[PDB]
């Protein structure tokens, strides 16, 4: 569960980095709260074009 960010956020905030977050942190808060999204190897290209 690496995911890519969206806004700032915690000791990793950056509007679009590849972090390595704990899954529960990921699929219970950030994504449902729209602060990140999974890095599904398709996603590692849209925020790897900027």
């Amino acid at each position: 569960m690496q995911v890519i960010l969206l806004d700032k956020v915690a000791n990793l905030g950056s509007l679009g980095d590849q972090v390595n977050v704990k899954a529960g942190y990921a699929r219970n808060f950030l994504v449902p709260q729209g602060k990140a999204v999974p890095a599904t190897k398709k996603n590692i290209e849209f925020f790897e074009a900027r």
Binding site: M1, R27, P32, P38
Partner: protein, 77 residues
């Protein structure tokens, strides 16, 4: 029933075995939980009775796919 809506995991029967190998019937049943999942693609939460792994699948494949299944298969949800 204790069936994982994602994997179809259900209880399975096996044995106990003592140090003397006495067999006593028993069941392994799955690590169910039931969990509010955000879809966004429907602006709603859906509670699936899900196994860990069921979760780990949802993590990987991603919810909507999994939801294509279930619906593809007829699961209520």
């Amino acid at each position: 029933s204790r069936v994982c809506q994602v994997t179809g995991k259900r209880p399975v029967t096996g044995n106990n075995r003592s140090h003397a190998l006495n067999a006593t019937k028993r069941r392994f049943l799955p690590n169910l939980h039931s969990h509010r999942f955000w879809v966004e693609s429907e602006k709603r939460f859906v509670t699936l009775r899900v196994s860990a792994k069921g979760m780990r699948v949802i993590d990987k494949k991603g919810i909507d796919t999994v939801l294509a299944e279930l619906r593809a298969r007829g699961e209520k949800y």
